[PDB]
């Protein structure tokens, strides 16, 4: 894939305990492949792990690193999660995958 002049912004932000800790993930885009041009979802660390495994199973994408589970601290982790999901979602191979869209939009 080679996409047209487009934008894709994904933000990871805090606004639970342990396994219930979640991150708000906000997507703004004009890319037609996405069902919604603006969205918010709530995801856990483990959903990022899940995404990485789906992608290794179903694609040729080389998935960037994840920052480490929690088990200073939280803000480094957020920034890691944000780099990760932007690189992946930027990848036109990952854009083609049902797992990325489920992760990003519930769609």
Swiss-Prot record:
One GO biological process term: negative regulation of protein transport
Homology family: Belongs to the sorting nexin family.
One Gene Ontology molecular-function label: phosphatidylinositol-5-phosphate binding
Function: Phosphoinositide-binding protein required for multivesicular body formation. Specifically binds phosphatidylinositol 3-phosphate (PtdIns(P3)). Can also bind phosphatidylinositol 4-phosphate (PtdIns(P4)), phosphatidylinositol 5-phosphate (PtdIns(P5)) and phosphatidylinositol 3,5-biphosphate (PtdIns(3,5)P2). Plays a role in protein transport between cellular compartments. Together with RAB7A facilitates endosome membrane association of the retromer cargo-selective subcomplex (CSC/VPS).
Protein name: Sorting nexin-3
Record localization: Early endosome; Cytoplasmic vesicle, Phagosome
Modified residues (Phosphoserine): 46
Post-translational modification: Ubiquitinated, leading to its proteasomal degradation. Deubiquitinated by USP10.
Gene Ontology, cellular component aspect: clathrin-coated vesicle; cytoplasm; cytosol; early endosome; early endosome membrane; early phagosome; endosome membrane; extracellular exosome
Location of the PX domain: 6-107
Gene (UniProt): SNX3
Assembly, per entry: Interacts with VPS26A, VPS29 and VPS35; the interaction with VPS35 is direct. The association with the retromer CSC subcomplex subunits is proposed to represent a functional distinct retromer variant described as SNX3-retromer complex. Interacts with USP10 and SCNN1A. Interacts with TRFC. Interacts with SNX8; 2 molecules of SNX8 seems to associate with one molecule of SNX3. Interacts with PTPRU. Interacts with MON2 and DOP1B.
């Amino acid at each position: 894939s080679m996409p047209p002049s487009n934008f894709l912004e994904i933000d990871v932000s805090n606004p639970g305990r342990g396994r219930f800790t979640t991150y708000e993930i906000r997507v703004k885009t004009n890319l037609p492949i996405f069902k919604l041009k603006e969205s918010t979802v709530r995801r856990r660390y483990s959903d990022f792990e899940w995404l990485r495994s789906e992608l290794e199973r179903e694609s040729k994408v080389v998935v960037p690193p994840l920052p480490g589970k929690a088990f200073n601290f939280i803000e480094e982790r957020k920034q890691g999660l944000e780099q990760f999901i932007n690189k992946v979602a930027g990848h036109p191979l990952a854009q083609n995958e049902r797992c990325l869209h489920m992760f990003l939009q519930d769609e």
